[PDB]
């Protein structure tokens, strides 16, 4: 029993890296990465995996963080490094978006070029 009570954490803990702004993936499956560390991360804060994938810290648990992955989890392995970005989600807003087709994060997907807005909003 215990998510962070894995033998690797336990052995290198009894034996003797920044675990405040950085974590390591304990388990990844079905788009839910458990991350040990990230002690400074906020609830619903967006974090960055080693493969460029982003995640959202949805479960702040006493010994790990349940992060939901914004993509395909085939690019995330156990032991991967997870960094903080310090920010909640935000999307670009403005008049520059009219006529554009974007995805759920405000990235253009119609190939007409990147969005040219000036302001972002949570």
């Amino acid at each position: 029993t215990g998510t962070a009570e894995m033998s690797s954490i336990l052995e290198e803990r009894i034996l003797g890296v920044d675990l405040e702004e950085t974590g390591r993936v304990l388990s990844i499956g079905d788009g839910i990465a458990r991350v040990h560390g990230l002690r400074n991360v906020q609830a619903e804060e967006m974090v960055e995996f080693s493969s460029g994938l982003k995640g959202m810290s949805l479960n702040l648990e006493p010994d790990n963080v349940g992060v939901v992955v914004f993509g395909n989890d085939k690019l995330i392995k156990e032991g991967d490094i997870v960094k903080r970005t310090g920010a909640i989600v935000d999307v670009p807003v403005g008049e520059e978006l009219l006529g554009r087709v974007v995805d759920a994060l405000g990235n253009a997907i119609d190939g007409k070029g990147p969005i040219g807005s000036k302001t972002r909003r949570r």
Partner: protein, 187 residues
């Protein structure tokens, strides 16, 4: 980080902690040293006063870890075992450490190459033929191996021997032969 897994693999929180300890010791070659260490720790804990001091779910974790760090600085324990008991106090798995101790024992019990043999007989065993059976059971092993033979007796098996080498099992008892002959004459 890479981990060194022992030849036997134990399970539960006991197995996980003992596996962590073994893979920590194998990187520095202090296996029997920390064996001595946890032996002393277990005999320290088995005394009733400090045991009830650490078994109390009313003592707050800082207080009990304070007493534990004091008593482990008392006996000049290696940083490895001090860290292990600190983790058992942190994760609250402390009351179970005895199992961990036992676990580690069994782990190193296959590090030196011992195999446990258990010989049951219907009669309290003699000396000569007992040594004879010891010699016979030694022939089933590879070199560098030791027999942990512990012969207890069951006077209900009506004769013969029931030998258990690891989990290999030979039932030379006579009650089973009686049951088999009855089954044969019945079917």
């Amino acid at each position: 980080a890479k981990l060194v897994r022992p030849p036997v693999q134990v399970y539960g929180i006991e197995g996980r902690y003992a596996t962590a300890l073994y893979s920590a010791a194998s990187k520095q070659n202090k296996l029997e040293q920390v064996e001595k260490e946890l032996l002393r720790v277990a005999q320290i804990l088995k005394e009733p006063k400090v045991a009830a001091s650490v078994l109390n779910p009313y003592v707050k974790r800082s207080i009990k870890v304070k007493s534990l760090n004091d008593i482990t600085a008392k006996e000049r324990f290696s940083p490895l075992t001090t860290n292990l008991i600190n983790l058992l106090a942190e994760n609250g798995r402390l009351s179970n450490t005895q199992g961990v101790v036992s676990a580690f024992s069994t782990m190193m019990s296959v590090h030196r190459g011992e195999v446990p043999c258990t010989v049951t007989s219907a009669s309290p065993l003699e000396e000569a033929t007992l040594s004879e059976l010891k010699t016979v059971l030694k022939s089933f092993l590879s070199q560098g191996q030791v027999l942990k033979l512990e012969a207890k007796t069951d006077p209900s098996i009506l004769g013969g021997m029931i030998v258990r080498i690891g989990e290999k099992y030979v039932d030379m008892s006579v009650k089973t032969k009686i049951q088999k002959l009855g089954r044969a004459m019945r079917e």
